[PDB]
């Protein structure tokens, strides 16, 4: 009962001091946390003792003139560049004393892959794999005004004819 | 009640915001929205996905000597420029200083087809099929040359 | 032996409890239930899943100057609101108690589909698919204005 | 040499036992077995699966008001319950203690679907299709009050 | 030259020997042989691959009450049993000794399928397709009862 | 300004070499040349793929008692034997000393398809598909008896 | 306003520059534009794709004896050679300088289809496809023969 | 002859003395006990000495605004918190002196792999694998209260038109 | 020209006097002898010395309500229980002085894999994959007579109209 | 310019003295001559030196009730038991002096492994990787009479109707 | 919002002073980026301290006669020739006192593999992977007259009837 | 804008002093050079070194009657045979002082796999793998008169009707 619309993804380069960069135009997405099980098992039973997990997200996007981000991504990739990053899902405000933040899941690390495509006529695509630097952290997190104005997004109003406007 | 030919049907490209005209001779015109919902099952329930709308209009009409406009829609077509285009039925005004303006639906895209077709002894016949992209604004819009 | 014109369809958004109206001049209306069921074989036998049923209904209707209604549905269709409906057959009252509301069927779902259609002098007609979003309840409904 | 109106047409729920009742006012029935035979190619010659057969009837009737089986189907097809039907001949009796009940097919199966319809001054009709679901039996079969 | 129903039309099991009959009241019989060769292309040139051919024939009659034939038609359908079929040409004779059968094609397969239909104030019909399993054999056979 | 009448069109198995005949009682006939190009997109333009053309001819004729070609021909089909045409139109004769054979299209190929059909009282009527396997060669071919 | 016999319809072939004809007892003429737009979903939005457009037009005409133009599209469609056609409106000169020379669209493809019919007692009929490959441009182009 | 719908799945953490949470909208489902042959073969023979188990459980669920346990999941996976969970088939009630209990298979472990996806216009949907320590033990059990209401689900009633119900 | 239907699958654990049990509902099948050659080559010539055999078999199967046998499926192959299982296929009976017996092949071992699947509004299926200790036999074997009448299997014989019968 | 039903598959067990067996409704079929290229490389040049071959022929067929064959190429798969095998291609007689020989290929092997498969009214076919014991032998072998006779295989001659035959 | 059909391909071999030369009618296109962690993890944190990445760029053609530098791809990937090559973005000029110069993706390496291949009545096409020896640079970048009157690619402008032009 | 059907091949065996043999009725054709780059990167730098090369080309055909090629490509498969063979492309002869001469890419080796395949009622068709001895060798090459009338490959002239020509 979720359109995954709603959910947002905000970046950010460490040792930088400014606001969020909205991801623009990304189709598909997905969050793996995979597990290895320390486990040892005795000769009578068995035992977990620990787990080292292996998180990452990975994304696709559309690459349109506007923004020059996924230049940044790249840059990230190629020069091993720390990058925060968190999903914050639009339409779960705070409960207490909390109502501009948003839900969210907030990680770090390094972007480990990245990898675009493009065809004859098309669109020309891209794919980036990102890793996650231990355990991610959640918490409601408020928004830049950028990213709110931009989600909005409405598209081409009312315009009139002969020549009243374009 | 409303008869067809009461509903005038307006197109222009974007970049020429001067420019103004209207489709002549129609014959039959057709609007239609076409919501994409299939269901995927679910163990304790079911949930009705939401889809986009792939809403498009097709109209036929004549073609004469003293008009050149479907020349500029096959053009489109193969160009594949822009468009926007005007769905207002007359004999509808404003409500409060936009009577000069009667109701109309206003979208912009582009012409998905041009298809003309002859046949000996008759006037030949040209079909577009014309594609929304997006919503549908709604207001009222003046005509040209009270016509 | 019921003519067809006894069979009333009304429409309101679930939002707007207060709202309430009627389909006019309807021409054809259809409901359908499809039955998902292919067997899968087996070695000893064979059995017959049961699946989800689609239901759905269309109806096409004309277009006239005191109404914006089909509007409505031309609107829900693209912004894909919820409706609801009712098929109510007059001449059908209760039993006891519910004899002024008349047997009727309620479903509350989306309306998949609007395309309307235009033909040189003569009345535009607009069709409308709506998917009724599962079981349909039965009971009876009173109408509005008595008619 | 048989006139179709010879061929009755019974339906009734496994459960309700005692129930029993039968189609009214049939236009167009129709009964179907396809066999499902595809060969796959062998080197040194050929052989024909031999597939499964699903058996189907559809049955196109009117609907009037002292009467609510129509309703009954229309609700299988949903709920997706069992049902079983008796296709009699009529005019054809048993040959040794069994003249009192006509030659019959007997067959146990779902209703896949149910679909009526409505035009402007006219009877609304409701066609149905409904799945056999295996062998469909032979025998006599007795009519009720007679008709 | 030859007028339809002149082609006489004759089945029977393979297992009853002695058991023979013919079809009735045919209206439309059609045989069909659908050779399957779709070339796949070549550098040097092409090919055209020789495949299986599924040839068919679909009848469609009338069903009276002094025959159950077409009942037995519905059972192998189903039963999926096997059968064999005569398509005699009347009026075409042997030539030496052979005269009292005229010349026909035979060839063994199943029925693939049955349908009949109804229709208020009306006969009802069966049509059948047969699948002939192979290549059909010609020569002379033999009618039974004279006719 | 051609009677299709006056289209006159033979065939014979390539292994019979004195063997002649030509098609009687035709009603339509057709010939189809399908070019397959489909263009796969490139990033600096667009290239158009030339592909195989699998030309065919389908014809529709009547059978009568003094004839048995068609019987060759539903033969052929089955066994896949190699045949060859001529699609000659008469009354256009050779330039120098070919006055007697008159234009025509030969081409080698099998019958892809056979079928018959049956409606009583009326005659019946045999359609046929013949793949031609290639180029299809051109020049003058004499007829048979003068006609 | 323009009554279809007056667009003349020219083809020749790109090597053979001095050659030039006209197409004959069109009956049915038909241009088609296809844009191929399927856009793909976005979270944030949608994009609408832009596709080639694969333009084509057909065309069925009559064959006559003092003619064999349509034997060489018969033929070209088989050997795929190129070709390069002129749709020239008649009654529409040029504006300054070119009014011997009328408004045309000019386009340079490959012929797609070739299927030509015959109906006993009548003239047979010869039907084409032309793949238009890429962008059509306009001017205008004079008649032969002043015809 | 027996549709899936009908089995349930319960959850609850282990050190948590609390009522176990059904887990809503899941779409597939899988269970697969692998087995590992300790076989030791002679020369003149063959034998098999035990057997270790690699069993699992995997599932996809829907991510419906409603319900934070897909959360919980994940928090499991990535902190490698205990989890016992059953699977209670409805429609099996208990045989003698036992009829609201129904069938089941009980199993703990820990979640060793949570991933979701999701696209353009899309309902947001995620997949999750379960080890099992050791075996699994089977027995009738009873569910609570709130998935017994859960269970029922009816769908939008009838209501009433003219304004005397929404 | 053989139907599959007409192969029948008989199971018993082993330390276990009773009849067998039929496998009701598979749809799929399979039975795979792999072999490693354990070939030995001269340096002038070539060898095979021997074969270690690898045989297994594998179904499917549809959990219907009445049948609890998945279930003991599940516990071998969870608990390593020796089974023995024989394809004994019908239709082909004993030629010498033998006629209720039917062509058979006869194999033990442990079952090595079972997992289930299932999805909404769907028959909950499963496969399982089942070793093989060392060779098989082959010979004719008999039926018990519970396979029997199960194998007829005839479906809703002819009732009656108006009350008569259900 | 070739059909493959022209293609002919004959068997015999080594160390028996009968006439070969066709195999019978066989669909595909395959015949693999790997090879492993003993090369040896100077740091100046590039040598090959020999070649270990890997040949090996894969079949299916359809089991049909006539024939016991498969059981045979089961026994053999299982057993370890050697068996010789030639394609002996039809319609390839001989050149000088040889009429009744046919074009062939002979090879020897043990048949490497067997795979049956079934499904729900479906015939049951099955698949064979039989391997190939170093190099094989061409040259024009003769068929046996029972061969020859099957070979034909006409299909239901013209039969009479009214009682004169079945 | 972007094209494909935009972005174009420079190459270049590195000793040869010339200018550069576009690769006609590449169909598809692709550039990955990976990268390997070189991180070491404390037994009470983690830690990244390096990548090692292993950039890559795809791409097909379509081998058309005229040109034969598919020819010069292939020598290079058999001869270990090292290559320099700049994707330059179409439509994206310079910003600051740059006009002609365009956007751009600057690297060197070896062609690693190269394969074509080829159907009946088809187009033969290729498909080459190329290295990039360690990080790449952007710049704007200008293009070559020859690459310049390429791009425009206009076709077959309007001629004339009855032999004023072919 | 390049046919496939243009190019040709020709094979023939090194040891043998006679004239090429084309290769009919290949359906698929490809061509790969792969290369291994040995390359050793300094702890403040990169460097390549060499490539090791693994060329190969494969191809298909499809088994006519006429022809015993195929039968001598299986003998080198299994005998080891080398062989020396090159594509020559038609259509694109000499430019000085040669106009029979034809572009073409000769190279040699050793047929590293053979394989055919065969349905029902389908021709029966085989996949080549053939290696390459180190880096092939590209110059003009003629044809020979065979190739040559091979090439033509005109079908069915026009013949005539009533016993003039078969």
Do not use: C
Request: proline share 1%; glycine share 10%.
């Amino acid at each position: 009962m979720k359109n995954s619309n709603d959910r947002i993804i905000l970046f950010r380069k460490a040792g930088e001091k400014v606001d969020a960069t909205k991801m623009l135009f990304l189709t598909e997405y997905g969050l793996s946390h995979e597990a290895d099980t320390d486990t040892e098992d005795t000769m009578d039973g068995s035992y977990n003792t620990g787990g080292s997990v292996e998180s990452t997200m990975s994304g696709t996007a559309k690459m349109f003139y506007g923004d020059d981000f996924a230049d940044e991504i790249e840059d990230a990739v190629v020069d091993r560049v720390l990058y925060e990053a968190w999903e914050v899902e639009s339409r779960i405000p705070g409960k207490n004393g909390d109502s501009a933040k948003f839900k969210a899941k907030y990680f770090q690390g390094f972007h480990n892959k990245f990898e675009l495509k493009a065809e004859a006529n098309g669109i020309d695509e891209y794919e980036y794999e990102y890793g996650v630097n231990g355990r991610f952290q959640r918490g409601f997190a408020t928004l830049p005004e950028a990213v709110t104005k931009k989600l909005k997004a409405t598209g081409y109003r009312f315009h009139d004819t002969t020549k009243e406007d374009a």
